[PDB]
Amino acid sequence: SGAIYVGNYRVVNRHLATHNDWANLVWEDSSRDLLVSSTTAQGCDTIARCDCQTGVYYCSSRRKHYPVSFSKPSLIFVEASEYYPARYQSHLMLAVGHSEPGDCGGILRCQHGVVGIVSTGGNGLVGFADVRDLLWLDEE
Ligand SMILES: O=C(NCCc1cocn1)c1ccccc1
Ligand SMILES: [Zn+2]
Numbered sequence: 001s002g003a004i005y006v007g008n009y010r011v012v013n014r015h016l017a018t019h020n021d022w023a024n025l026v027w028e029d030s031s032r033d034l035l036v037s038s039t040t041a042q043g044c045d046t047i048a049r050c051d052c053q054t055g056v057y058y059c060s061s062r063r064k065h066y067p068v069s070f071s072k073p074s075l076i077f078v079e080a081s082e083y084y085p086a087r088y089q090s091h092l093m094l095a096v097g098h099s100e101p102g103d104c105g106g107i108l109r110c111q112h113g114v115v116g117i118v119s120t121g122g123n124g125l126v127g128f129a130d131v132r133d134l135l136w137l138d139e140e
Contacts, residue, residue, distance in 0.1 A: 014028055116129050
């Protein structure tokens with residue numbers, strides 16, 4: 001589990017969104033595994049605006065943050081899970097690292113701010129849904 005809290009937005013994995021998220025919906029995209037809902041309180045996270053390929057992510061199944069090198073956001077075929085059939089997921093970045101299903105939502109960050117959240121994994125890989133292209137998270 002986990003979310004990004006930037007401005008009056010909450011960014012979560014679409015497959016983990018609650019009824020309150022869907023009832024306060026700003027934007028959602030199944031192909032990216034992302035959903036954004038509105039918040040009453042202002043958040044403290046800031047979004048990175050960059051092309052970094054090195055950063056640190058939080059792994060809840062280890063209670064640890066790990067430094068990683070990750071690929072650029074791409075269209076990747078992801079195997080079936082409890083939440084999606086096997087399909088192409090867009091804007092996805094891969095790294096070598098531990099992940100389990102409940103690690104979704106952990107933040108990946110670089111020197112510039114939040115880069116994305118854990119969305120996929122297995123066999124020593126972790127995949128992150130990028131948010132750096134969503135410029136509108138910084139305003140309104
Ligand atoms: O179940 C997982 N992800 C659920 C969401 C998903 C995105 O594409 C397909 N399902 C998962 C599995 C192992 C490690 C980390 C994450
Ligand atoms: Zn960066």
